[PDB]
Amino acid sequence: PSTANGGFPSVVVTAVTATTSISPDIESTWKGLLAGESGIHALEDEFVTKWDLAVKIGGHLKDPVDSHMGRLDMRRMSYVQRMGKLLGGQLWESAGSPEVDPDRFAVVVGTGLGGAERIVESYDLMNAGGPRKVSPLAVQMIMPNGAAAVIGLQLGARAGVMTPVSAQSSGSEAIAHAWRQIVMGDADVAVCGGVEGPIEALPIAAFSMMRAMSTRNDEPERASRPFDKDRDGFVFGEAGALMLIETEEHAKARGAKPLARLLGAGITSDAFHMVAPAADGVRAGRAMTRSLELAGLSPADIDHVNAHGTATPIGDAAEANAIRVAGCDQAAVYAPKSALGHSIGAVGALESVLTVLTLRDGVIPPTLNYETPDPEIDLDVVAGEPRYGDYRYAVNNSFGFGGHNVALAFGRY
Amino acid sequence: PSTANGGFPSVVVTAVTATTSISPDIESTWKGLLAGESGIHALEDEFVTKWDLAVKIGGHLKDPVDSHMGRLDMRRMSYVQRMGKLLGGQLWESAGSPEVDPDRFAVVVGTGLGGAERIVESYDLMNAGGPRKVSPLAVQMIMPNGAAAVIGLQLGARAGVMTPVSAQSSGSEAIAHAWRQIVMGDADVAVCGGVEGPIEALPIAAFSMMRAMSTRNDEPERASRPFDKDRDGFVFGEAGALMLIETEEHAKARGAKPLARLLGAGITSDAFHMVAPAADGVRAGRAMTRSLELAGLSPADIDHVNAHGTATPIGDAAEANAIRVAGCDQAAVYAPKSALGHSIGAVGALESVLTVLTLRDGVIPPTLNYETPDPEIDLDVVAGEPRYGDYRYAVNNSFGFGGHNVALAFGRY
Ligand SMILES: CCCCCCCCCCCCCCCC(=O)O[C@H](COC(=O)CCCCCCCC[C@H](C)CCCCCCCC)COP(=O)(O)O
Ligand SMILES: CCCCCCCCCCCCCCCC(=O)O[C@H](COC(=O)CCCCCCCC[C@H](C)CCCCCCCC)COP(=O)(O)O
Ligand SMILES: C=C/C(C)=C/[C@@]1(C)SC(=O)C(C(C)=O)=C1O
Ligand SMILES: C=C/C(C)=C/[C@@]1(C)SC(=O)C(C(C)=O)=C1O
Ligand SMILES: [K+]
């Protein structure tokens, strides 16, 4: 049973939404990426000078989420819930505000952590004033399923609301489980993707003490260099992204025009190390291969891989080996974190949206900063200008601390 | 496609482990439940008198996790990671330390929040001493997939390590997803269940300010009264629990004796309110119905329901309606939170283990404190003494804030 042999129903992507450091409008982000734009800038936040942080660069959203939030939203939701509400409404409107059967409608939204600012706020309030200063809303704002639950309540989803957490693969893992929910017959339509918090001092300190972050502060747009010989770690770039997926039958019955097909998904784990990927890429390549088995594709069918490509020395080398293991190392490769940075729990969902746009429009944007090939890598990294083609099938990769490997196989509609 | 019709492979439970407020030994917890024991006591923690907390009752683990941990693990793992390492090693030993194929072995472990004490710790450290005082291990201890990832690394699981977060249904949801992973062909064997943090002052304040908790401080063992007319909210009782599931042919091949069969799982959502269950019980009933459809059972086959039964007024009334919607209201009902209290992200896993032991041993423990029947409930609540019977099929219910409904259908082996 595969998508190609009709063992699974055909599942299509019928709407996308994202907010990024380039634009709040996904179509404008996409045009910016194709024009070689970067969302990364010097950080001007007072927290950078307060703490004299070693990292002084990153991409805040172009259009801050809270400029769209009312007084009560700011007091009743954590930041990732507010992002989830903003994007869920935008996605539904982009889909034509369909009146779907709530009992066949699921939501699957990943995030790295949850409403953690409300944990530190509640802690401070109780230390200063005692237990009765904690909000009656604290639990529901903090719980990591909070953003998915807000979207499910907002949009009326009664076929399940799920939150897989797998660190930096959470946003792709969510789209994998939404596809599973549909092909298993538990839903006909799902909103899925990932949301994440903004850049702040404590997140920068924690990842900096792992020695995982770029410190190329003098040239912020040049700092994120996935697959490049001179890379020196990742750069934060804020985002959130959701997509609407549904059976092809369901889309046809309501007149939705698909953007792409979501053909299959593979999830594996390394059992190697908690915070470094296995150098051999074997289990990561097996997640890619499993997505092909469930799609009914061979590796030679894959015209494009949207790489997780964080720009760490270790991570990019492992992913290049994984792509080789899966037989996909003659695909054209894009590493979007070169322009958009790393949004942790959201980023797999953002990069799945970009993989969809590559299939819809026949173009891969250039990987920024790809100037000096690294002989360990040996991939067809698209650089300098966009790569045009009749792309038929593509894989999006995402990986996370914990050893999680997620691959999603998409096709042109 | 159902378990009964052979459309899904047969999946069996081959080992269980749990630590509770009654015992660290699940067989002793089980004997204690049957004897009418309660794990709930007056809280003697200094934090109760420090804050003059309204809630002064709960069940700490009989044997603290950290009596088994050294200072190095106590500094380099969060508490839920330490609980997961302790339980995962105990489970694997109980299973006979099998040499399974890593590439066919998955882990699915839910939790409500994650390594949140390390969030407030890192915040305090940075406020006192700057960003370079944050631990280089802080991210991997905080991330909510951390416990599942520790277990996956410890035991060698390469077929996926998943953490579904759905608040108080997370422990059951994890078992649901592990069953899906096996029946979809991505694993032959899985460790699954849930872990959760201990009772502490800030968790008590947050839930207390929801007005959800019992304050029957005078008579701690009498406080948790699921389905009783005089119930007044839930009581914390610490736990963590894991089970080993595997295909029946994998169990046979290694000579493992099954404890029970895991036949099907249903997940739905309410889209009603963030922290109140839908009064009609309709979507929660449909999670039970879905687990029967995938099992290949009818409601008339069900002998036993292990209720989520938190002892809130509105919660138990909605669940009674859900059990009626599913046609399961002739079954014998147990509410284990009456004795063990509520362990949040672990509790659905704990109660799945108890459902397995009910089928294995042909006995349901008494629901403690069930003294005055409530006309809105109208269920056969087992009480007073344990009830012996030839139980063949049981459903375990769990629900969570966000409107999450999970039902698991188990059978006697
Ligand atoms: C692309 C970035 C991704 C970062 C990913 C981090 C993961 C979670 C990020 C959650 C942060 C949400 C912050 C939103 C609210 C906000 O902004 O509040 C500022 C004031 O600062 C704060 O309250 C800071 C509160 C910090 C909360 C605790 C963060 C703990 C971080 C860990 C120690 C390290 C990261 C763990 C990641 C684990 C999961 C992924 C592997 C404006 O305040 P005001 O002036 O308007 O009053
Ligand atoms: C059955 C209870 C379930 C409760 C579940 C609630 C969530 C669990 C969160 C994990 C808590 C782990 C605590 C382990 C370490 C420990 O205990 O450290 C104490 C000292 O206290 C602390 O550091 C407390 C640290 C507080 C951490 C933040 C807690 C935030 C809680 C939220 C405001 C409210 C709950 C949100 C739940 C959302 C998910 C479920 C809906 C001994 O110190 P020492 O003797 O070693 O010196
Ligand atoms: C098991 C550890 C893995 C997969 C680590 C990666 C490559 S994932 C990721 O997103 C990332 C960074 C630093 O962003 C990694 O270092
Ligand atoms: C949508 C909200 C739900 C399901 C609420 C429940 C009944 S679940 C649970 O575990 C619980 C408590 C207080 O423990 C609830 O109040
Ligand atoms: K990618």
Ligand SMILES: [K+]
């Ligand atoms: K239960």
